[PDB]
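ok posting inputs for the 8OH job
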Amino acid sequence: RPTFYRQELNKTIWEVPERYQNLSPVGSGSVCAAFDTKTGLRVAVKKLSRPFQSIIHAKRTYRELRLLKHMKHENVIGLLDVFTPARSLEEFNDVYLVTHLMGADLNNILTDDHVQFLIYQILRGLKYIHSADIIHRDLKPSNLAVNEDCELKILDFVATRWYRAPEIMLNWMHYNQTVDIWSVGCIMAELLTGRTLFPGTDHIDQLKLILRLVGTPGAELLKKISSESARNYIQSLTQMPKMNFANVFIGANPLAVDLLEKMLVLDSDKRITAAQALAHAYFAQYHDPDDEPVADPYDQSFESRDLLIDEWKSLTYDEVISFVPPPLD
Ligand SMILES: Nc1ccc2c(NCc3cccs3)nc(-c3ccccc3)nc2c1
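and the output
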């Protein structure tokens, strides 16, 4: 039960344990860079904004704490600490999250050898996340933290639609994990060209650019679309042939072109998985089957539950008290 110290930083007040020093605002819940006197590391402290404001907020706060507490992988952001100034459930209102301070994002950043290492680390993190039955859904360069060492970590908290799989913008329920692989393809394409692959102005224009590259679907994909309106609209467009990816990505590593062909597929049933992609020949120099682990089981059953604010709040308090700090190395 450490001593807490308070200071007003920009808008809001901050009450943190003494071990975290030299708070410096970084963004805006609010996030401060600080120095961790227990480990000697630079860390990011995030103070959640109104974490229990509504049923939706309280469950969202609970969801975020559960996910971060579960992630233990080199290419996924991990939780160093979670704390509150409160001494009891009764006075519990503020939640603070502490993670490693990550240098920059992929947006702030390329050789073919850099793209291999960077995309290999994303796919390595996605295999872990997907093995827990978790879908990211929001992969984009600003959700990828990169070191000065080119070490990459997937994060979660430049248009989001540019990286979204086409099934999500068509509002298909029952999409699978490969919506993330579509995002990887869009990211890898941008690192190889310097240009956004699908800079759509909106959701309609986004699909137009996507289909111009991958083509309008064939009858094998059409016979699996349940929506009659979506099926008619797609069938009424002028048929566009699939462009040759070697032509579009001219001068790139033919192994990189072959992988993009397997990631940017309309039919998500045919799209390549993270595990399958890790064994693609394009990653021969980094791929190690004995060092690409999967995650412990993750209980998502709370997602289907409707509870009161105080109950999500109490479940969140439980997760704060039961937190075991990660081992120091
Ligand atoms: N097994 C599969 C594989 C892909 C699918 C897909 N892909 C998005 C597009 C398909 C054709 C043009 S965009 N879209 C849908 C879908 C279903 C209902 C409403 C709207 C879209 N289903 C798919 C089922």
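notes: The chain is about 35% helix and 15% strand. The first helix runs from residue 55 to 70.
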